Amino acid sequence: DVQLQESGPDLVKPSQSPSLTCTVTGYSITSDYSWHWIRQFPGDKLEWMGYIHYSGSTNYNPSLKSRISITRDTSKNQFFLQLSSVTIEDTATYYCARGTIYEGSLDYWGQGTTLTVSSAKTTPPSVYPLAPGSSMVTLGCLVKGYFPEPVTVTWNSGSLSSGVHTFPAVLQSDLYTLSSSVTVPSSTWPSETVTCNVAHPASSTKVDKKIVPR
């Protein structure tokens, strides 16, 4: 078939000018179609950015006419998206696509690349235990103030997955914070040891926090 793969930097600092690459295999970017870029913001809002025609012609979204540019390399069979003087609002998942003028649509999509824009420094998380005061018992784990993503949260080194609810990270002051809960039998708590396992490979940190009754 025809497939498209996106590549580039995951993380970029504001006011910089990064570039994404779309590698295409199974068809020549020089024969017929148009070749597009689309971004998906948080909230999953999608915006068409522009395209490079098989002839080499380009056209962009009027709201991005001057801030961006699209180029191509015929020898490598690749096309590029050039961001310029980037901001944190440019944080999105960037997709490349093939487009038909006959069908007026994008027929093939790539598995996009997430490009996050932040000035925050690589900081490891603080790991906090959550225990109740006074049937089933729910314990918790708070990972506070880490950058960048991802974080791996595990319960009992990988032994518990049945009651585990791990929540998406939310932004504090330029820093990420996620929660995880685990619901267990009262016969196993505090009778047996329950440990929250946290890893943040970006800062190269592994923290284990055993929950203790209050």
Partner 1 sequence: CGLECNFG
Partner 2 sequence: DVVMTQTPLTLSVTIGQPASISCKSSQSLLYSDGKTYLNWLFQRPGQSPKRLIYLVSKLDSGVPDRFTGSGSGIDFKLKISRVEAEDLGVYYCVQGTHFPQTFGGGTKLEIKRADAAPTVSIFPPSSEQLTSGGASVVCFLNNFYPKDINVKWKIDGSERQNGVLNSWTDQDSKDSTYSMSSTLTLTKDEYERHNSYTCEATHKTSTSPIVKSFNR
Residues that bind partner 1 (CB under 8 A): 34, 51, 53, 57, 59, 99-101, 104
Q: Fill in the per-residue mask, 69 to 108: x = in contact with partner 2 (CB under 8 A), - = not in contact.
A: --------------------------x-------xxxxxx
Contacts of 151 (CB under 8 A, 6+ apart): 125, 143, 169, 176, 178, 198, 199, 200
Rg (CA), the chain: 23
CB of 52 to partner 1, least distance (A): 11
Q: Which amino acid is at 206?
A: K
What does 124 bind: partner 1, partner 2, none (CB cut-off 5 to 8 Å by kind)? none
CB of 167 to partner 2, least distance (A): 4
* Tally of residues, the chain: 214
What does 131 bind: partner 1, partner 2, none (CB cut-off 5 to 8 Å by kind)? partner 2
What does 2 bind: partner 1, partner 2, none (CB cut-off 5 to 8 Å by kind)? none
- Write out the E strands in the chain: 3-7, 11-12, 19-25, 34-40, 46-53, 58-60, 69-73, 78-82, 92-100, 105-109, 113-117, 126-130, 136-146, 152-155, 164-166, 170-171, 176-185, 195-200, 205-210
CB of 68 to partner 1, least distance (A): 15
Where along the sequence are the contacts to partner 2 (CB under 8 A)? Answer: 44-48, 61-63, 95, 103-112, 126, 128-133, 136, 138, 140, 142, 144, 165, 167-170, 172, 177-179, 181, 183, 214
